[PDB]
Amino acid sequence: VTLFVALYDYEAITEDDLSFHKGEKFQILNSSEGDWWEARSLTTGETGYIPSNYVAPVDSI
Amino acid sequence: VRPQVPLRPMTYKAALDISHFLKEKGGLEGLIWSQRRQEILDLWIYHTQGYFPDWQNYTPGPGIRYPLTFGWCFKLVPVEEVLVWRFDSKLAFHHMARELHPEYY
């Protein structure tokens, strides 16, 4: 019910983080606290941690 | 330029993941140490991956310098003080730093 999108590219070094490009969309799996949220890409389908501030609501800008 | 990522605490896993990434890329392996170089690394990592740069430290004293953070698997090796980055998989299984300088823990 709440979808976010890549404002910028990001590329991971750790296997548990999710690499992506700008425009890649995301469903959020874990807003535990860590500003690194768990997310699923709507482009690949893959799941892993991403930096929260790289993504924006599909309702704002 | 893409902006700063959020801060997150280092973990054994992350340390290891990175060790291996930098070995895989080669790059660091066999490069001569320098405060400036190390700062360059610490920056890239802190900005790109959000890990605070207090982790990539090594033991003091003449001879080989062993890493303080468990699972950072690069040591600094004299060559002929004057040191070069050297990878060592054993350092993922052994905390040589703690064995030699347990006063830090």
Side-chain angles (χ1 to χ4, degrees), chain B residues 22-23 26-33 37 74-77 79 83-87:
Chain B
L22 296 182
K23 169 164 150 49
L28 188 62
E29 170 62 70
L31 166 55
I32 298 152
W33 195 86
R37 291 217 215 294
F74 282 84
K75 60 192 177 186
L76 304 175
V77 171
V79 55
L83 302 164
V84 308
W85 269 286
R86 208 97 275 178
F87 180 90

Side-chain angles (χ1 to χ4, degrees), chain A residues 3-33:
Chain A
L3 223 55
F4 289 83
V5 66
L7 308 157
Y8 318 92
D9 281 20
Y10 167 80
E11 313 276 289
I13 280 91
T14 40
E15 221 246 288
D16 304 21
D17 295 344
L18 253 212
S19 301
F20 53 81
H21 304 79
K22 178 182 176 170
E24 218 170 301
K25 287 214 155 69
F26 304 97
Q27 260 292 35
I28 315 310
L29 286 69
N30 206 337
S31 304
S32 239
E33 189 207 321

Side-chain angles (χ1 to χ4, degrees), chain B residues 10-12 15 38 53-61 64-76 91 94-105:
Chain B
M10 183 56 65
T11 91
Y12 173 73
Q38 183 150 323
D54 69 23
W55 61 271
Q56 191 225 151
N57 276 276
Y58 310 75
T59 55
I64 310 157
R65 317 302 176 76
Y66 294 81
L68 297 180
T69 322
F70 195 34
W72 175 234
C73 308
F74 282 84
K75 60 192 177 186
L76 304 175
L91 300 183
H94 198 22
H95 211 214
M96 272 300 281
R98 182 211 221 103
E99 188 124 304
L100 293 174
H101 295 265
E103 77 269 353
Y104 297 122
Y105 319 96

Side-chain angles (χ1 to χ4, degrees), chain A residues 8-17 34-37 49-54, chain B residues 1-8 13-15 17-18 21 44 47-51:
Chain A
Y8 318 92
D9 281 20
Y10 167 80
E11 313 276 289
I13 280 91
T14 40
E15 221 246 288
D16 304 21
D17 295 344
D35 298 354
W36 295 61
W37 294 335
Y49 288 125
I50 57 161
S52 51
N53 65 329
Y54 270 42
Chain B
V1 188
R2 52 173 173 152
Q4 171 84 72
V5 309
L7 275 61
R8 159 149 265 185
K13 174 62 153 43
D17 275 42
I18 297 155
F21 184 93
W44 179 52
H47 184 136
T48 307
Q49 304 300 295
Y51 292 92

